[PDB]
Amino acid sequence: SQFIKPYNDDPFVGNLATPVSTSSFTKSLLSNLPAYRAGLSPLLRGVEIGLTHGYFLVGPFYKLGPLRNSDVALLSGFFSALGLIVILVACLTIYGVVSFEETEAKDQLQTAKGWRQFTSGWLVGSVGGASFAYILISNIPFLQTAGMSML
């Protein structure tokens, strides 16, 4: 048995079919991620990705930022995470302007209208996920420490 084969039956394309690349488990994960999942509008793809990324962004800023030992650390962690999100949304916006020409179609990410929808969703989701992480950390003492409240 051989686990490595040419990519999509083509021996001369610059890729290989390896278990990491093209196993059934890998195919299931890639196909079900919001970027690639079927039946999702570009805006909804942006929302789901945004919620995930904004939620984890708050934590490193809060625990390791300059104001970490202060009593305003969570507020600083939220503002710095929000500041990063605002910069990232601008990165998405400028990419959309140069990369895609204007066309009628709006149902795909790699279209000017579609990329704009993805940016709108990602902005709202990142603000929403960062806000959710803020509420949870503000109220639950386990999250404020590293779980160190139990010891």
Partner 1 sequence: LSVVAQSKSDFEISDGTPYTLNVPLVGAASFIGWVVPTLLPSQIALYGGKGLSTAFFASIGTNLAKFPAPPGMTDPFWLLCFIWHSGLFATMILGSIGYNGYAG
Partner 2 sequence: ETLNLQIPSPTFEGSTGGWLRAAEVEEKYAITWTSPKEQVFEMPTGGAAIMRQGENLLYLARKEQCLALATQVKNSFKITDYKVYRIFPSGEVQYLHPKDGVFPEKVNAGRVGVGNVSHSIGKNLNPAQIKFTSKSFNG
Annotated binding site for chlorophyll a: 35, 37, 48, 53
Q: Is position 36 an interface residue for ligand WVN (rule: CB under 6 A)?
A: no
Least distance CB 18 / partner 1 (angstroms): 7
Q: Among 41, 76, 131, 144, which residue interacts with ligand WVN (rule: CB under 6 A)?
A: 131
* Total residues found in the chain within this entry: 151
Distance CA 40, CA 108 (A): 9
Q: Is position 78 an interface residue for ligand WVN (rule: CB under 6 A)?
A: no
Q: Is position 31 an interface residue for partner 1 (rule: CB under 8 A)?
A: no
**DSSP conformational letter for 108:** S
Q: Return the residue matching tokens 């625990």.
A: 63
Instruction: Let me know the angle formed at the C-alpha of 124 by 115 and 86, rounded to the nearest 5 degrees.
Output: 80
- Which residues are at the interface with ligand WVN (CB under 6 A)? 51-52, 55-56, 128-129, 131-132, 135
